[PDB]
Enzyme design. Structure first.
Site, short mmCIF file in Angstrom:
data_model
loop_
_atom_site.label_atom_id
_atom_site.label_comp_id
_atom_site.label_asym_id
_atom_site.label_seq_id
_atom_site.Cartn_x
_atom_site.Cartn_y
_atom_site.Cartn_z
N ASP A 175 0.82 -1.20 0.00
CA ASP A 175 0.00 0.00 0.00
C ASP A 175 0.86 1.26 0.00
O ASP A 175 2.04 1.24 0.37
CB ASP A 175 -0.94 0.00 1.20
CG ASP A 175 -0.21 -0.07 2.53
OD1 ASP A 175 1.02 -0.26 2.53
OD2 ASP A 175 -0.87 0.06 3.58
N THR A 205 -5.90 2.09 -2.59
CA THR A 205 -5.92 3.52 -2.28
C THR A 205 -4.99 4.32 -3.18
O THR A 205 -5.13 5.54 -3.26
CB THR A 205 -5.54 3.74 -0.82
OG1 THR A 205 -4.23 3.22 -0.57
CG2 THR A 205 -6.54 3.05 0.10
N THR A 206 -4.04 3.66 -3.85
CA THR A 206 -3.15 4.37 -4.76
C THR A 206 -3.88 4.92 -5.98
O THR A 206 -3.38 5.85 -6.61
CB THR A 206 -2.02 3.44 -5.22
OG1 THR A 206 -2.58 2.30 -5.88
CG2 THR A 206 -1.19 2.98 -4.03
N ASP A 247 -6.89 -4.22 6.66
CA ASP A 247 -7.60 -3.82 5.45
C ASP A 247 -8.81 -4.71 5.19
O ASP A 247 -9.80 -4.26 4.61
CB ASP A 247 -6.65 -3.84 4.25
CG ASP A 247 -5.61 -2.74 4.31
OD1 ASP A 247 -5.80 -1.79 5.10
OD2 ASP A 247 -4.60 -2.83 3.58
#
Lengths: 458, 505, 491, 522
Positions: free
Chosen positions: C45, C78-79, C359
Site C-alpha cells: 500500500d 488507495t493508490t 484492510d
C-alpha cells in the site's frame, strides 16, 4: 537502447521536420532562413529544397535524400509537402505501433488500401490530349500558375508559362537544352530566342550567300608563328564566317556550353586546321549582342529561356520552377491520363478507402480507416495556412462530396472563394499523384521496418 | 581463462540480439551507421558485420562465418549465420561451472553428426512426381522471399528469377557468370531480362539522343588502344627544330590512327567496343560510317563477349581474324537519358544479364542478395532434388530424435546433448518476438507436436496458429540445412578453443 | 510564473503517481523502504510509501493527507486516488491551454463527481445486512491489492463473523476501534483464529485494574527499620486486596521510576494474585468495556465494586508465548469486544498479516457504513466514464471537453491493472470498450481470465463506499492543486 | 533520501546474495572448509554454522535480513543442517531472476513454485516412510552419524552414538494431556580442558556448573529424598558503638536465616552468592551440603526438574523471617564428580521432569565450541526425530529423486508455469553440485548418475517388479555406488517437511520488489 524504446528515439523525430515545412506548403508558404555548415545562406518558401540540404543527427531524416532527388526531378509540382505527405502515413502508424500492431500488418494495410483508391482516380480521370491545340495549350498555362511557382509568379506566371509552352511545342515530336539567366530586368521583360545562350562576347553579321546562315566555324585547337597566324584567319573568311569559336572573336568557351552550340546549329567540331570545310560548318542565323544572341531561323531542337528578375533570388526561384515546369508538361503530353489536384486529388483517395473499409472489415477495418485519416491530414496543412479550420472545413466538404459523387470540390490552395478545382483549371499529372501518394508507401517500407539501430565508432 | 570467454561470447551475442529479426519473412530490417555516411539497411549479416567496427579480435570470427557462408553454401546469411553462435549462448552457464568445454565441443560434434542422417531421413524425393523446373523452382522461389522487404510484389520477381536461371546453362551455375545491372530510380516492375552482354553503366558525351535505338544486325568489334589527338597518346622523344614542326606531329599521329581504323573497317562492324574510352577523333570518323561506338569496356564485360561471338582484344591490325567478327539477331538500346546495350540471339553465350531497376538504392541492394541466394537454391536443387520445410522449423522434429540418443549416453555428455536440443528452441523463441506471438504458447504445442503428428511441423505464421509448412509449398534445399550445422560446428569449436587472447600495443 | 511554477510540481507529482502504479493489483509489486532508525519496512500500500517519503515539493506532501483519509476507509487500492489525481493534472495541462480558468476546470471535476456518485447509486447492488455468503465474497475480492486470498480460507469467515458479533446487524456505525490485534511470534497464517474474550499481550480469577504502582512508601538499627516499615505498608495493601478477592492485578507503565518492588511480589505470590505492569492507558477502553474494570486511582478507594468480572480466566501458552485468555464476558455493554491473535513465523509475515487483516476489517466497515456492491477489476470505472462521455455531448458547453478528459482519466485505473499483468495498454482497453457495450453495466472483469465474465459466480464483489470515497477524495485533491498558483518558502 | 529505479535494483540484491552465498557454500558437507570471523575487538571465533555467520554478517540490503530470520526460524524447527537448508534459498533467487527478465511475470514464478511445492507434498510423502531396518536405538544412531553435514565433528560420531543418543532417552516425560515431550535445554553442557573429546561422559540427570573451593563442605553424601534449597539472598558512623550495634545484629541475623533452612530438612543448599566459612559450620553439624556461587539461570532449570523453588530473601506473612519447606525440591541422590580438579554437583532422580547432562573435554575453547553448539544442534534434531517416526533417506539424495516426478508434473500443469517447474527441478541439482566442489569431484559425472538411476523406477512399471535399482543412491566421499541403508545414513522428516516449505517462501517477497527507498539516518 534496443526494442520499442529505441524506435521511439528515432522514428518520432520525423514529426519535427514535418512541422518545419508544414507552413511553407503551397502559395501561402513563408520564407524560411537556412544556414549550411559551410556558411551559405538559403532563403526560400519551398520546403522541398529546405530539407534537401540540411545537417541533422538522426538517420530518420536521411531517407528523405532519395525522396528529394526523385520527386523534384520527376515531377517538381506539389513536391513541397511530399515529406508531410510521407509522414502522414507514418503519424497514423505511430498510433498503431503503440497498440502493438506488427509493422508488416501496417505496411500491407496501407499498400492494399492505396491500390483500392486507384480505381476511384480512374473514374475522375480526364484527358487533355483529346481536345484541340487551343484547350491543350490553355491547360498548360494555368497548371503551374496556381500550384508550382509559389514566389511572386502567382499573378505573373502568364509570362513564364507562355515562354515555357512555346519551348515545348518547338521540340515536340529538355536534357539537350541548356538554360540559365542573368539578374536584371523584370518578369514580363524576359526574352526568348531559338538557340543557346552565349555569355561570352567578342559586331553585327550581314546575310551571307546562303539563306539564313552564318556558316559558323568552331575549332578546338588554337592556331599554332605570325606567318601561320594571319594565314589561318583568312581561311575562315574563305567560307564567309565572321565569328570563330576557339578555346585559346569568341574565346574561352566552356566544355558543356560549346556542345550546345553545335547541337543547335547541327554542325561538327573541327579539331585540326585541315578539316575546315563548308560541310563541317554549323548553321546559325546571326550572332549579335542585344551576352551574344544566337538565333535559328529554321525550327531546331534547342530552345532556351532567359530568366530576368529584379532580385538575385528571383532568378534562382524562377529558373528552378522552369526545371520543374518542363518535367510536369513532359508527363502531361506523354501520359494522357490527368487528374485535378490542388487538394481535390488527396481528398478523392480518402473517400475511396473510407467506403471500402466497411466492406472488408476484419483486422484491416481500423487499418483502412487509419489510411483514410492519414490522407485527411494532407488538406489540414493547407487549411491552417489559408485560415480555414482543418476539422471544420473537411467535415463540411466530406458531407457535400457524399451526396454528389464529384470530388473536385475541396480545399483551395490559393485561398480564393472558389472551392472547385475544375473551375480554376487546376490539372496535375496522374503519374505525379502516383509518384507522390502511392510511392510514399515505398518510403514507409524502410521506416516501418526500423527495429534496432547500430552505431559504430570512429 | 573461462571468465574471458564469457566476455567474448557476450560481445558476439550482443550483435546477434539485433540480428534476431532476420530468419523468416516476418523479420525486420536493421539499421547501421558507418563513417562514410553511406549505409545499407538489410537483414543480411555479411554486409552488417563487414562495416561494423570490431573491438575484440575474436569478434572477427563472425565476419569469417559470413565469408564461409557464401563459399561453402552461398545463402542463408539471414538464417544460418545468426544461428552459428547460438550454441555459445546455451554454453554460457557451463563456463562458470567446472565443466570443461573439451567434452562440450565433442558433444555438439556428435550431435550434428547424427542430425545429418536425420535430415536425409526426412528428405522427400520429388523426382517421383516428375516435377520439372517450373513447379519445383517456383515453390522454392517463394521460400527465398523470406527476410526480404518485398513480399506482396514478390510475385513479379518469382517469374523473373526462375526464367533467368533457366536461360542460363544448368551444368555450370555461378553468380559471377550472370550479370546484374542495378539502375537507381524508376519502379520495380520495370526490370527486364537481357539475352546478351550489356555495358557497365552508360557513356554520354557530345551527341547522345542523335543515335538511333533501332538497329537490324550490328556486329561486335574489339579494340585496345585509346583514340584521341595529342592528349592520351603515348609520350615519345621528338626533336623539334621550329614551331612549324608541330604540324608534322599532328599528321604523324592522325595517319597512325587512320591507317589502323581503315584496315579494321573492312570487317564492317556496326558496334565499336574499345578497352579504353573513345574520343572525338574516332567519333567523327565513325559518324561518316553511321556505326555505333562505345568505349570504357570493363574487364568483366569482355569475358562475357568471348563466350558469345568469340572475339579477342586486338592491339594491332595484323592479328585481325575473320573468326573474331560476330553478330547478333537484334540490338535495342534501353532509362534516365542513359543508353543500355542489349544483345539478343546468342545461343553460344554461356553468360546471362539481368536488368534491375528500382527507386531506392538500399532496397535494390538486397535484391542483388536475393539473386545470389536464389541461384544457390536453384543450383543445389537441380543437382539433388530434396524437400525440406523452411522457416527454421526443420530442427523442431529433429530435436525429439536427438533426445533419444542422449538417453543412451549415461555420461557427462548426456546433459551436453540436452543443451544442444535446448539451443534449437531458440529458433522459435526468436520468431515469436518478431511477430509478437507468445513464445510459451508455441513451445508448449511444440513439445506436443512430435508426440502425435511427427513428420513435418512448420508453425505456419499466416494463420497465427500451429501448422505444417509442407502443405504450404515451402521448400528448401537440404544441402543448405546439412551444411548449416557444419558452419556452426567450426564456429563454436573455434571460440571454445581459445582460453585467452594476446594484444600487443 | 503562475503556470510554470505549478507545472514544475505536477511533473514531480505525476512521477510519484506513476511509480505507485506498480503497487496496484494482484500482479503488482511493492517497494523496499529503509527507515532512518535502521528497520526495514516493506508494504504494497501507499500508506507507508508516502509516510517515509520526504519531498521538498508541497504537492507531493499534500498527497499524504489526502491518501491518509482513504487509507483509514479502504486500505486496498488507495493508490488509485493518487493515480487519478496525477491523471487529471496531466489532462488539465491541455485543458488550460484552451483558455479555461483553473477553477472552472476544478469546478467541472466536482460537477462530474456528483454525477459519478449517482451512477454508483444506480449501479448499486442489493446486499443483505448479515449474511455469510455475500460478505465473504466481497471481503476477499477487495484484498486483491496484495497477496491475501491464498491463505484467506480461514481468514475470510473470521472478519465476517467477528464484526457482526461486535455490535449488531443493524449496520449504522460499527466502529473497528474495539478490535484488539495481537501479534505473537510463532504459528502460521492459517492458525490465526478469533478469541471469545480479551487476551493479554504482556482458574476463574478476577481481573482488577490499578492506576497506581504498588511499592513501599517511596512515591515517584537502621537495617530492621527499613525492612519493617516497607513490609508493613505492602502488607496493608495485600489485606485490602485479599478481602476483595482479586486474583489478577493490572498496573500502568512502570518503566519510568518507581516500577514494582520485589518485596510486594513475595506477599502476593502466597495469595496467588497476578501482577501485570507496563500497560498503556489506551488499553483501559478494552478493560472497561470488555472486562467491566473501573480505574482505581488510590489504594484508599480500592474496593470490590471497581473490580471487573469474568467467568474463567486462564493462561494459554502458544509456541512459547504467554497469553492470558478470558472465557466469558459479564458486564453492561451494548457492543461486546472481540480480540484476534495474529500468529506467524517471521516478523515480516506478522507485520504483513496485520495490514492484510486490518484492510480486511475496513472493507467490512465500509459495508456496514453504506450498503452496496459493485463490480471488480475497474469495470464500474468504465461505465461512469461512458455516461460522462455521452452527457458531455448532451450539455455541450466548455465542460464537454473537460468531462471527456475527466472520463479518460477514469480509464487509467483499469489500464493500470492490465499493464501490471503483462497486458498491452491500449489493445486491451480497445477490446474492453466493445465488451463493456456487451456485458451491459454491472457485468465485471476478472483478473485470471483477463476478460469480461461474471462477478458473483467468480466470487468478485466490491463495496460501493470505496468507489464513492475514492472519487470524492481525489476530486478534492485535484481542485486544491490547480487552485494554488504559486508557492513560497518562509518561516 | 533518494530512490533507485529500474530492474537493476533486483540484480543488486542477487549479486549481493551470490557474494555471500559462495562464502557459506564452503562449509557444506564434511568435505567443506570452516571459516573464521572477527568481532573487530581483536577476538575471533571458529564456527561453520550459518546461523552464527548470518548473525555476524553485515548486509545493508533487506535481502540479508531475510536470511537472518530464516536461520533463526530453522533453529527452532530443526536446529542443525543450516548449510543444507539456508543455502537452498540462495540459488532459488538466481534461477528465478533469469526467467522474469523477458517472457515471465514475477507472480508466475510465485504461483509456479507455490503450486509445485503444494503438489510436491504428496511426492515427498511417497519417498517419506517410517523408520525401517533399525533395531532398538539404531534409528538415532544412524541419524547421529549424519551430522557430517553442516558439522565437521561427524568423523567422531562413532563414539557420539552413545553419549548423544542416550542423553535424550532419559529426559522422556508426559505432559500436555498425555503427550510425550522432550523439553529443550534440559541437557546441560559442561566444558573442560584436557585429555580428548572421547572422554565425554553422560550423566542421567542435571549437573550443576560450579567449583568446590572451601574444604569445609562435606566430601560424601548418601540417602534418598534429598531436599534442594535454592536461595538468591547474599549472606556472608561517628562512634564505634554504632558500628558494634549493626555488626552484632547482622552476624546474628545471617546465622539465624541459615537455621531457618536447617529446620526445613534441606540436605543440600544452593546459594547464588558466596557463603562465609561460619555459615558452612552449621552445615557440617546438621549434615547439610553447602554450595555457593550459583548462576540464577542454572537454578531455573532445577525448578522445572526437581521442583525446588528459588527464594529471594527470608520473609513470611508476619514480621518473622523464616524458610518454608514447600520451596524444597526432590532428588534421589547427589554425586560429586571431580574433573581436572573441578568438582560439579550431579542431581539425579528429578521429580517434575527428567533431564540429563553432558561433560565435554578438549584442548582450547575453540575445540570445545566446535563440540558444544554442534552436539547441541544434534539434540534438537533428535527432539523432532522421535516426534515423527517417518524418516527420509539421508545423503541429500531426495532432491534428485523428485526431479523425475517434476518432469511428468510439468506436463500436467504446463501453461506459463512449465518453465518454472523445469528451473525448480534444476535448482535441486545444485545441492549435490556444491557437494562435488568441496569434495574435488566431477559434478557432471554424479548428476548424470542421479538422473539415470533414480529415474529408472519412474519409467519402469512398479507393479512389474524388475526394480533393478534401489533409488534410495549416491556417495560423497568415494564417488561410488553404495547404499546408505547398509551404511546407516538417514534423515528425519523435519529436515524437509516444515523446513524447505518456509525456505522456498523467501522468493515471494523478493520477486515483488519494485525499487529501493532509503531514508537518511539521524
Amino acid at each position: 537502447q534496443h526494442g520499442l524504446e529505441a524506435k521511439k528515439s528515432h522514428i518520432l523525430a520525423a514529426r519535427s521536420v514535418a512541422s518545419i515545412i508544414k507552413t511553407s506548403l503551397g502559395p501561402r508558404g513563408l520564407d524560411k532562413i537556412l544556414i549550411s555548415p559551410d556558411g551559405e545562406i538559403t532563403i526560400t518558401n519551398d520546403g522541398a529544397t529546405i530539407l534537401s540540404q540540411m545537417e541533422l543527427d538522426n538517420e530518420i531524416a536521411k531517407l528523405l535524400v532519395q525522396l528529394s532527388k526523385s520527386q523534384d526531378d520527376e515531377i517538381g509540382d506539389g513536391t513541397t509537402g511530399v515529406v508531410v505527405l510521407a509522414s502522414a502515413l507514418l503519424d497514423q502508424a505511430l498510433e498503431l505501433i503503440q497498440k502493438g500492431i506488427h509493422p508488416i500488418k501496417i505496411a500491407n494495410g496501407f499498400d492494399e488500401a492505396a491500390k483500392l483508391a486507384i480505381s476511384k482516380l480512374e473514374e475522375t480521370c480526364d484527358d487533355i490530349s483529346a481536345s484541340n491545340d487551343e484547350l491543350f495549350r490553355d491547360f498548360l498555362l494555368r497548371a503551374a500558375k496556381t500550384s508550382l511557382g509559389s514566389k511572386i509568379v502567382s499573378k505573373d506566371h502568364d509570362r513564364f508559362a507562355e515562354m515555357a509552352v512555346e519551348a515545348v511545342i518547338n521540340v515536340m515530336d529538355f536534357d539537350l537544352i541548356k538554360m540559365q539567366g542573368r539578374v536584371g530586368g523584370s518578369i514580363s521583360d524576359s526574352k526568348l530566342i531559338n538557340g543557346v545562350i552565349l555569355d561570352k562576347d567578342f559586331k553585327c553579321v550581314l546575310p551571307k550567300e546562303g539563306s539564313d546562315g552564318v556558316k559558323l566555324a568552331i575549332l578546338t585547337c588554337p592556331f599554332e608563328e605570325q606567318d601561320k597566324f594571319k594565314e589561318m584567319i583568312d581561311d575562315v573568311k574563305k567560307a564567309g564566317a565572321d565569328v570563330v569559336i576557339c578555346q585559346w572573336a569568341v574565346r574561352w568557351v566552356g566544355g558543356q556550353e560549346l556542345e550546345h552550340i553545335a547541337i543547335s546549329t547541327n554542325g561538327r567540331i573541327v579539331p585540326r586546321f585541315q578539316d575546315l570545310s563548308k560541310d563541317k560548318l554549323g548553321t546559325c542565323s546571326r550572332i549579335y549582342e542585344q551576352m551574344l544572341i544566337i538565333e535559328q531561323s529554321k525550327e531546331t531542337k534547342t530552345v532556351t529561356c532567359f530568366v530576368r528578375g529584379s532580385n538575385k533570388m528571383i532568378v534562382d526561384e524562377a529558373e528552378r520552377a522552369l526545371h520543374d515546369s518542363l518535367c510536369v508538361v513532359r508527363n502531361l503530353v506523354k501520359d494522357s491520363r490527368v487528374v485535378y489536384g490542388g487538394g481535390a486529388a488527396e481528398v478523392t483517395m480518402s473517400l475511396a478507402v473510407s467506403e471500402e473499409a466497411d466492406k472488408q472489415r476484419g483486422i484491416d477495418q481500423y487499418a483502412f480507416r487509419g489510411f483514410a485519416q492519414a490522407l485527411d491530414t494532407i488538406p489540414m496543412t493547407l487549411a491552417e495556412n489559408s485560415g480555414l479550420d482543418p476539422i471544420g472545413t473537411l467535415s463540411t466538404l466530406k458531407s457535400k462530396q457524399l451526396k454528389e459523387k464529384i470530388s473536385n470540390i475541396g480545399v483551395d490552395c490559393l485561398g480564393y472563394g472558389s472551392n472547385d478545382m475544375k473551375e480554376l483549371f487546376v490539372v496535375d499529372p496522374f503519374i505525379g499523384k502516383k509518384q507522390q501518394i502511392l510511392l510514399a508507401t515505398q518510403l514507409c517500407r524502410m521506416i516501418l521496418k526500423i527495429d534496432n539501430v547500430i552505431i559504430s565508432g570512429k | 581463462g573461462k571468465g574471458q570467454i564469457i566476455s567474448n561470447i557476450n560481445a558476439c551475442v550482443a550483435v546477434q540480439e539485433a540480428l534476431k529479426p532476420t530468419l523468416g519473412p516476418l523479420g525486420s530490417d536493421i539499421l547501421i551507421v558507418t563513417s562514410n555516411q553511406k549505409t545499407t539497411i538489410s537483414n543480411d549479416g555479411a554486409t552488417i558485420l563487414k562495416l561494423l567496427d570490431v573491438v575484440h579480435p575474436a569478434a572477427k570470427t563472425l565476419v569469417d562465418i559470413s565469408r564461409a557462408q557464401d563459399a561453402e553454401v552461398g545463402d542463408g546469411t539471414t538464417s544460418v549465420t545468426i544461428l552459428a553462435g547460438e550454441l555459445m549462448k546455451e554454453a554460457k552457464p557451463f563456463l562458470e561451472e567446472g565443466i570443461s568445454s573439451h567434452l562440450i565441443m565433442k558433444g555438439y560434434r556428435k550431435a550434428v553428426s547424427l542430425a545429418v542422417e536425420k535430415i536425409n531421413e526426412l528428405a522427400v524425393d520429388i523426382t517421383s512426381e516428375k516435377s520439372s523446373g517450373r513447379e519445383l523452382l517456383e515453390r522454392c522461389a517463394r521460400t527465398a522471399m523470406s527476410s526480404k522487404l518485398i513480399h506482396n510484389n514478390a510475385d513479379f520477381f518469382v517469374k523473373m528469377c526462375v526464367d533467368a536461371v533457366l536461360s542460363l546453362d544448368r551444368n555450370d551455375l555461378d553468380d559471377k557468370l550472370i550479370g546484374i545491372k542495378k539502375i537507381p530510380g524508376g519502379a520495380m516492375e520495370e526490370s527486364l531480362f537481357i539475352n546478351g552482354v550489356a555495358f557497365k553503366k552508360t557513356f554520354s558525351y557530345a551527341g547522345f539522343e542523335q543515335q538511333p535505338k533501332k538497329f537490324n544486325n550490328p556486329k561486335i568489334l574489339s579494340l585496345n588502344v585509346e583514340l584521341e589527338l595529342k592528349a592520351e597518346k603515348d609520350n615519345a622523344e621528338v626533336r623539334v627544330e621550329h614551331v612549324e614542326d608541330y604540324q608534322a606531329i599532328v599528321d604523324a599521329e592522325w595517319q597512325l590512327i587512320f591507317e589502323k581504323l581503315r584496315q579494321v573497317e573492312e570487317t564492317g562492324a556496326n558496334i565499336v567496343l574499345s578497352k579504353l574510352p573513345i574520343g572525338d577523333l574516332a567519333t567523327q570518323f565513325f559518324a561518316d560510317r553511321n556505326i555505333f561506338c562505345a568505349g570504357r569496356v570493363s574487364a568483366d564485360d569482355m569475358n562475357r563477349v568471348i563466350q558469345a561471338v568469340g572475339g579477342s582484344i586486338q592491339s594491332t591490325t595484323s592479328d585481325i581474324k575473320p573468326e573474331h567478327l560476330g553478330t547478333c539477331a537484334l540490338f535495342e538500346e534501353m532509362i534516365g537519358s542513359e543508353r543500355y546495350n542489349l544483345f539478343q540471339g546468342c545461343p553460344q553465350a554461356k553468360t546471362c544479364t539481368l536488368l534491375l531497376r528500382g527507386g531506392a538504392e538500399q532496397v535494390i541492394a538486397e535484391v542483388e542478395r536475393s539473386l545470389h541466394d536464389a541461384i544457390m537454391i536453384v543450383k543445389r536443387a537441380l543437382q539433388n532434388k530434396l524437400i525440406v520445410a523452411g522457416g527454421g522449423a526443420t530442427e523442431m522434429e529433429v530435436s525429439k530424435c536427438l533426445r533419444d540418443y542422449s538417453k543412451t549416453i549415461a555420461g557427462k555428455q548426456q546433459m551436453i546433448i540436452n543443451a544442444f536440443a535446448k539451443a534449437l528452441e531458440v529458433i522459435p523463441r526468436q520468431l515469436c518476438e518478431n511477430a509478437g506471438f507468445d513464445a510459451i504458447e508455441i513451445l508448449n504445442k511444440l513439445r506436443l507436436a512430435h508426440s502425435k503428428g511427427e513428420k513435418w511441423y512448420g508453425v505456419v505464421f499466416e494463420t497465427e496458429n500451429i501448422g505444417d509448412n509442407f502443405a504450404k509449398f515451402v521448400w528448401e534445399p537440404a544441402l543448405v540445412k546439412i551444411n548449416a550445422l557444419n558452419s556452426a560446428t567450426e564456429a563454436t569449436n573455434l571460440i571454445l578453443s581459445v582460453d585467452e587472447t594476446i594484444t600487443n600495443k | 510564473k503562475p503556470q510554470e511554477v505549478r507545472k514544475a510540481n505536477i511533473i514531480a507529482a505525476r512521477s510519484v503517481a506513476d511509480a505507485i502504479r506498480t503497487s496496484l493489483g494482484p500482479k503488482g509489486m511493492d517497494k523496499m523502504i529503509k527507515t532512518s532508525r535502521g528497520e526495514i519496512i516493506i508494504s504494497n500500500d501507499g500508506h507507508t510509501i508516502l509516510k517515509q517519503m520526504a519531498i521538498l515539493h508541497p504537492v507531493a506532501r499534500m498527497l499524504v493527507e489526502v491518501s491518509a483519509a482513504q487509507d483509514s476507509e479502504a486500505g486496498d487500492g488507495t493508490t488509485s486516488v493518487v493515480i487519478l489525481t496525477g491523471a487529471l493534472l496531466g489532462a488539465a495541462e491541455r485543458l488550460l491551454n484552451k483558455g479555461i480558468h483553473p477553477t472552472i476546470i476544478a469546478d467541472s471535476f466536482q460537477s462530474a463527481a456528483k454525477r459519478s456518485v449517482d451512477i454508483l447509486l444506480e449501479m448499486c447492488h442489493k446486499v443483505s445486512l448479515s449474511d455469510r455468503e455475500q460478505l465473504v465474497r466481497a471481503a476477499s475480492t477487495s484484498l486483491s491489492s496484495k497477496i491475501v486470498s491464498q491463505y484467506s480460507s480461514f481468514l475470510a469467515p473470521l472478519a465476517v463473523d467477528s464484526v457482526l458479533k461486535i455490535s449488531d446487524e443493524n449496520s449504522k456505525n460499527v466502529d473497528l476501534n474495539d478490535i484488539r490485534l495481537v501479534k505473537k511470534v510463532g504459528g502460521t497464517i492459517d492458525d490465526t483464529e478469533m478469541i471469545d474474550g480479551v487476551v493479554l499481550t504482556q482458574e476463574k480469577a478476577k481481573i482488577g485494574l490499578i492506576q497506581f504502582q504498588i511499592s513501599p512508601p517511596k512515591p515517584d538499627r537502621q537495617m530492621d527499620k527499613i525492612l519493617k516499615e516497607e513490609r508493613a505498608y505492602l502488607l496493608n495493601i495485600c489485606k485490602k486486596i485479599k478481602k476483595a478477592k482479586c486474583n489478577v492485578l493490572l498496573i500502568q507503565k512502570s518503566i519510568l521510576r518507581d516500577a514494582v518492588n520485589d518485596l510486594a511480589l513475595h506477599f502476593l505470590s502466597k495469595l496467588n494474585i497476578m501482577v501485570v505492569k507496563d500497560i498503556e492507558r489506551e488499553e483501559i477502553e478494552f478493560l472497561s468495556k470488555g472486562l467491566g474494570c473501573k480505574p482505581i486511582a488510590d489504594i484508599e478507594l480500592f474496593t470490590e465494586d471497581r473490580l471487573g468480572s469474568a467467568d474463567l480466566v486462564e493462561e494459554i501458552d502458544s509456541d512459547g508465548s504467554k497469553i492470558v485468555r478470558v472465557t466469558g464476558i459479564r458486564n453492561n455493554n451494548a457492543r461486546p469486544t472481540v480480540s484476534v491473535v495474529i500468529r506467524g513465523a517471521n516478523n515480516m509475515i506478522i507485520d504483513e498479516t496485520e495490514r492484510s487483516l486490518h484492510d480486511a476489517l475496513c472493507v467490512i466497515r465500509c459495508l456496514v457504513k453504506e450498503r452496496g456492491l459493485i463490480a471488480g477489476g475497474g469495470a464500474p470505472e468504465i461505465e461512469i466514464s461512458r455516461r460522462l462521455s455521452k452527457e458531455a455531448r448532451s450539455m455541450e458547453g466548455v465542460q464537454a471537453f473537460i468531462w471527456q478528459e475527466f472520463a479518460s482519466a477514469l480509464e487509467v485505473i483499469p489500464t493500470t491493472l492490465a499493464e501490471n499483468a503483462g497486458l498491452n495498454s491500449i489493445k486491451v482497453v480497445t477490446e474492453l470498450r466493445s465488451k463493456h457495450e456487451n456485458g451491459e453495466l454491472n457485468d465485471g472483469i476478472s483478473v485470471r481470465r483477463s476478460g469480461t465474465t461474471n462477478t458473483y459466480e467468480e466470487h468478485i464483489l466490491q463495496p460501493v463506499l470505496v468507489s464513492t470515497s475514492a472519487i470524492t477524495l481525489a476530486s478534492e485533491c485535484v481542485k486544491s492543486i490547480l487552485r494554488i498558483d504559486d508557492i513560497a518558502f518562509s518561516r | 533520501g533518494e530512490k533507485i529505479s529500474g530492474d537493476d535494483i533486483r540484480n543488486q540484491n542477487v549479486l549481493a546474495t551470490m557474494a555471500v552465498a559462495n562464502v557459506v557454500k564452503s562449509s557444506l558437507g564434511p568435505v567443506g572448509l570452516d571459516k573464521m570471523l572477527v568481532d573487530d575487538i581483536g577476538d575471533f571465533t571458529v564456527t561453520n554454522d550459518g546461523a552464527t555467520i548470518l548473525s555476524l554478517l553485515d548486509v545493508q540490503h533487506p535481502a540479508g535480513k531475510i536470511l537472518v530470520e530464516l536461520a533463526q526460524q530453522q533453529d527452532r524447527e530443526i536446529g542443525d543442517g543450516t548449510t543444507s537448508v539456508v543455502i537452498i534459498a540462495s540459488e532459488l533467487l538466481k534461477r528465478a531472476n533469469e526467467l522474469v527478465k523477458n517472457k515471465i511475470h514475477p507472480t508466475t514464478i510465485i504461483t509456479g513454485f507455490r503450486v509445485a511445492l503444494r503438489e510436491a507434498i504428496r511426492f515427498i510423502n511417497e519417498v517419506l516412510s517410517t523408520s525401517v531396518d533399525t533395531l532398538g536405538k539404531e534409528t538415532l544412531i544412524n541419524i547421529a552419524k549424519t551430522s557430517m553435514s553442516s558439522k565437521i565433528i561427524g568423523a567422531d560420531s562413532d563414539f557420539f552414538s552413545n553419549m548423544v543418543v542416550d542423553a535424550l532417552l532419559a529426559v522422556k516425560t508426559q505432559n500436555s494431556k498425555g503427550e510425550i515431550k522432550y523439553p529443550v535445554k534440559a541437557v546441560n553442557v559442561l566444558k573442560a580442558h584436557g585429555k580428548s573429546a572421547t572422554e565425554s561422559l553422560l550423566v542421567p540427570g542435571y549437573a550443576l556448573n560450579c567449583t568446590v573451593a572451601s574444604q569445609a563442605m562435606p566430601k560424601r553424601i548418601a540417602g534418598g529424598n534429598v531436599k534442594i534449597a535454592c536461595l538468591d539472598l547474599n549472606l556472608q558512623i561517628d562512634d564505634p558503638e554504632q558500628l558494634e550495634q549493626i555488626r552484632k545484629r547482622e552476624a546474628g541475623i545471617v546465622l539465624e536465616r541459615v537455621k531457618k533452612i536447617i529446620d526445613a530438612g534441606a540436605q543440600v543448599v544452593l546459594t547464588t552468592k558466596g557463603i562465609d566459612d561460619l555459615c558452612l559450620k552449621e552445615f557440617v553439624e546438621a549434615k547439610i551440603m553447602g554450595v555457593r556461587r550459583c548462576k540464577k539461570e542454572d537454578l531455573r532449570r532445577i525448578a522445572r526438574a526437581t521442583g525446588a523453588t528459588l527464594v529471594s530473601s527470608m520473609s513470611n506473612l508476619e514480621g518473622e523471617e523464616t524458610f518454608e519447606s514447600s520451596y524444597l525440591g526432590l532428588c534421589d541422590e547427589v554425586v560429586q564428580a571431580k574433573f581436572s580438579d573441578d568438582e560439579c554437583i550431579l542431581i539425579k532422580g528429578t521429580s517434575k521432569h527428567s533431564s540429563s547432562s553432558i561433560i565435554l573435554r578438549g584442548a582450547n575453547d575453540y575445540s570445545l565450541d566446535e563440540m558444544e553448539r554442534s552436539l547441541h544442534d544434534s539434540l534438537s534434531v533428535v527432539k523432532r526425530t522421535l516426534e515423527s517416526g517417518n524418516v527420509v533417506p539421508g545423503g541429500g539424495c531426495v532432491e534428485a529423486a523428485l526431479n523425475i516426478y517434476l518432469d511428468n508434473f510439468a506436463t500436467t500443469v504446463g501453461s506459463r508455469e512449465q518453465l518454472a517447474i523445469a528451473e525448480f527441478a534444476a535448482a535441486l541439482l545444485i545441492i549435490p553440485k556444491t557437494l562435488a566442489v568441496n569434495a574435488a569431484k566431477d559434478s557432471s559425472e554424479l548428476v548424470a548418475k542421479l538422473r539415470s538411476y533414480h529415474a529408472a523406477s519412474q519409467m519402469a512399471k512398479p507393479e512389474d517388479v524388475k526394480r533393478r535399482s534401489y533409488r534410495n543412491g549416491l556417495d560423497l566421499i568415494r564417488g561410488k555406488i553404495v547404499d546408505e541403508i547398509h551404511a546407516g545414513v538417514l534423515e528425519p522428516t523435519i529436515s524437509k517437511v516444515k523446513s524447505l516449505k518456509s525456505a522456498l517462501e523467501a522468493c515471494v517477497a523478493i520477486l515483488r520488489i519494485d525499487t529501493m527507498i532509503t531514508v537518511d539516518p539521524e
